[PDB]
Amino acid sequence: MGKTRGMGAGRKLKTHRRNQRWADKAYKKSHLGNEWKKPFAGSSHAKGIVLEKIGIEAKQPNSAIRKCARVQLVKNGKKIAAFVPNDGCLNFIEENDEVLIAGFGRKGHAVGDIPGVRFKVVKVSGVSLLALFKEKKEKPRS
């Protein structure tokens, strides 16, 4: 608009500016973080919820292989997790809830819900009802 489109020595100036102003996110991402990350955790705790209403979800803190410790939410009803184990984390965004930057999605040692149907691959079990959980527990022990 200023110039719009001319010649004699002049396009370049507001090419520079646009990059510089840039909102979104530069240089892909990692100041924590992304990608499938398997943090082995030993903190089971409970944390509060966002300004709108209350609850008390049960959470488990996990320390990541890529060196970070944060609180992650667990989805599905019920759960157990043991010696360590390795529970794999999606790192999805709420757009926010306090200190809860990620959640650990179902993955290996991260179990799924009390023998059901309803459904079974959100909130999740085993063959027909259960069958998977029985086997799952065995793995870490031996």
Tell me which residues touch another protein (CB under 8 A).
3-12, 15
Q: Is 74 helix (H, G, I), strand (E, B) or coil?
A: strand
- Smallest distance from the beta carbon of 74 to RNA, in angstroms? 13
- Smallest distance from the beta carbon of 25 to another protein, in angstroms? 23
Establish if 117 lies at the interface with RNA (CB under 7 A): no
Establish if 1 lies at the interface with RNA (CB under 7 A): yes
DSSP collapsed to 3 states, 86-117:
EECECCCCCCCCCCCCEEECCEECECCCCCCC
Q: Which is nearer to RNA, 127 or 141 (CB)?
A: 127
Instruction: Yes or no: say if 37 and 65 are a contact pair by the CB < 8 Å rule.
Output: yes
- Smallest distance from the beta carbon of 76 to RNA, in angstroms? 11
Subset of residues 54 to 83 that bind RNA, contact rule: CB under 7 A: 54, 67
Establish if 50 lies at the interface with RNA (CB under 7 A): yes
Give the DSSP H/E element, type plus range, for residue 19. helix 13-21
Establish if 46 lies at the interface with RNA (CB under 7 A): no
Query: For the chain, what percentages of helix, strand and coil (3-state, to nearest 5) are there?
Result: 15, 20, 65
Report residue 8 as tokens.
């004699």
Q: How far apart are CA 114 and CA 78, in angstroms?
A: 6
Residues that bind RNA (CB under 7 A): 1-10, 12-14, 17-18, 21-23, 25, 27-32, 34-36, 48-54, 67, 88, 90-93, 95-101, 105-108, 110, 120-122, 124, 127, 132
